Enzyme design. Structure first.
Site, PDB file in Angstrom:
ATOM      1  N   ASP A  36       0.726  -1.189  -0.114  1.00  0.00           N
ATOM      2  CA  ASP A  36      -0.104   0.091  -0.050  1.00  0.00           C
ATOM      3  C   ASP A  36       0.806   1.159   0.030  1.00  0.00           C
ATOM      4  O   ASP A  36       1.378   1.731   0.935  1.00  0.00           O
ATOM      5  CB  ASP A  36      -1.043   0.035   0.946  1.00  0.00           C
ATOM      6  CG  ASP A  36      -2.006   1.096   1.195  1.00  0.00           C
ATOM      7  OD1 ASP A  36      -1.984   1.739   0.138  1.00  0.00           O
ATOM      8  OD2 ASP A  36      -2.540   1.187   2.271  1.00  0.00           O
ATOM      9  N   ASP A 232      -1.059   5.502  -5.695  1.00  0.00           N
ATOM     10  CA  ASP A 232      -1.552   4.756  -4.478  1.00  0.00           C
ATOM     11  C   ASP A 232      -1.796   3.226  -5.000  1.00  0.00           C
ATOM     12  O   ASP A 232      -2.903   3.163  -5.443  1.00  0.00           O
ATOM     13  CB  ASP A 232      -2.754   5.383  -4.053  1.00  0.00           C
ATOM     14  CG  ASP A 232      -3.474   4.570  -2.725  1.00  0.00           C
ATOM     15  OD1 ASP A 232      -2.597   3.630  -2.163  1.00  0.00           O
ATOM     16  OD2 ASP A 232      -4.296   4.879  -2.459  1.00  0.00           O
TER      17      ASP A 232
END
Ligand SMILES: CN1C(=N)N[C@](CCC2CCCCC2)(C[C@H]2CCC[C@@H](NC3CCCC3)C2)C1=O
Length: 387
Positions: A36, A232
């Site tokens: 992440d 992201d």
């Protein structure tokens, strides 16, 4: 150079996340962990959950250290709560090192774990500024760099299959690579182009121009970065600020107007299907995002195909997809479907993000993804949003 030990160490897909195997504790407890780049906590399932078949058992680790502090993390799509501690952590298909890192042991969660994702925790790879509860909780990668000689850089090759993977196939398939401490030249073609990291919190970047099939969206470039633009891996879609999304969808609809799609498709809710092998890629436009370059008044562009922004989903023998471009009220998010087109270098040491065409991007015989430059672009600092 070449980092064979780390190549092909990821599994997963854009809709459920890409994950890497890690170990926590003594003796080592193996867990699969979501990669992440949009958060900064190492947080793992530590209590039974219907979607978990394993979790971190602190009482079985001799090296577990309790920090006697809780952490509550609400996010728009859900929440996670846990208990802070430290333990020895390793990445089996990573650098041959063990580090003492902060771990949030998840005790309660809402819309965090994904049924069938095969991961049991998350590895927040962004900076301490956005770590929870505050910036004193050193993120994993900062611990790794401080305790070892691993260079302060990692790179990601997320590999979309270009078709749906069933439960057994997604478990057996190679989903990509996370190269820790370097750049592996086998994972990309052509040149790497770098954009500055604007500020070290999220991996923040500045978009300076947007094209749909070469046609300039012609918006004030501040709109593209309102209120920020980030890279992201923990978001599926390319998310665009409301006004930018409205203009982009209008242009994508106009370019693809030889076929009409229902409103639910454009809202990213409803799938569209075509007879096997007949997906009309050529009616959909390419999308180019120009990013600020490292040289004054210079930019470069990354170009994605519909094979990136149409996400394969199961329906039959039809080839089905969801539109993986969606609206945001918190800025642009370059999610996994965009990252699947490129090898992305998170060069923390030089405060820059590199892009190159991925050796595993999905394309057709007529078009490919691209990373090209340079272009003369003036007043790029004006594209960044303030306040
Ligand atoms: C968008 N985004 C992230 N990139 N990470 C979090 C936390 C953000 C933090 C919150 C605290 C402040 C800083 C930002 C949580 C993460 C939890 C697990 C599920 C995952 N999404 C799935 C995985 C792949 C696709 C969809 C989201 C999020 O909301």
């Amino acid at each position: 150079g070449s980092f064979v030990e780390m190549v092909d160490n990821l599994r997963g897909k854009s809709g459920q996340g890409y994950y890497v195997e890690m170990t926590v504790g003594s003796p080592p407890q193996t867990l699969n962990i979501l990669v992440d780049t949009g958060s900064s906590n190492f947080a793992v399932g530590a209590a039974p959950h219907p979607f978990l078949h394993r979790y971190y058992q602190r009482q079985l680790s001799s090296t577990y250290r309790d920090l006697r502090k809780g952490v509550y993390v609400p996010y728009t799509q859900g929440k996670w709560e846990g208990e802070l501690g430290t333990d020895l952590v390793s990445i089996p298909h990573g650098p041959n090192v063990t580090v003492r890192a902060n771990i949030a042991a998840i005790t309660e969660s809402d819309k965090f774990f994904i049924n069938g994702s095969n991961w049991e925790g998350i590895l927040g790879l962004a900076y301490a500024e956005i770590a929870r509860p505050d910036d004193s909780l050193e993120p994993f990668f900062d611990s790794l760099v401080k305790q070892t000689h691993v260079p302060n850089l990692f790179s990601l090759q997320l590999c979309g299959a270009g078709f749906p993977l069933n439960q057994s196939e997604v478990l057996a398939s190679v989903g990509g690579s996370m190269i820790i401490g370097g750049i592996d030249h086998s994972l990309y073609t052509g040149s790497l182009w770098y954009t500055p990291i604007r500020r070290e919190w999220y991996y923040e970047v500045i978009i300076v121009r947007v094209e749909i099939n070469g046609q300039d969206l012609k918006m004030d470039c501040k709109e593209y970065n309102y209120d920020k633009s980030i890279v992201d891996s923990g978001t599926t879609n390319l998310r665009l600020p409301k006004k930018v999304f409205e203009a982009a969808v209008k242009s994508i609809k106009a370019a693809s107007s030889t076929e009409k799609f229902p409103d639910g498709f454009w809202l990213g809710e409803q799938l569209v299907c075509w007879q096997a092998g007949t997906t009309p890629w050529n009616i959909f436009p390419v999308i180019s995002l120009y990013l600020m370059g490292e040289v004054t008044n210079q930019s470069f562009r990354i170009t994605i195909l519909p094979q990136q922004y149409l996400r394969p989903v199961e329906d039959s023998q039809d080839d089905c997809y969801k539109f993986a471009i969606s609206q945001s009220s918190t800025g642009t998010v370059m999610g996994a479907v965009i990252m699947e087109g490129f090898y992305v270098v998170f060069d923390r040491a030089r405060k820059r993000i590199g892009f190159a065409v991925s050796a595993c991007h999905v394309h057709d015989e007529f078009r490919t993804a691209a990373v090209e430059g340079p272009f003369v672009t003036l007043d790029m600092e004006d594209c960044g949003y303030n306040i």
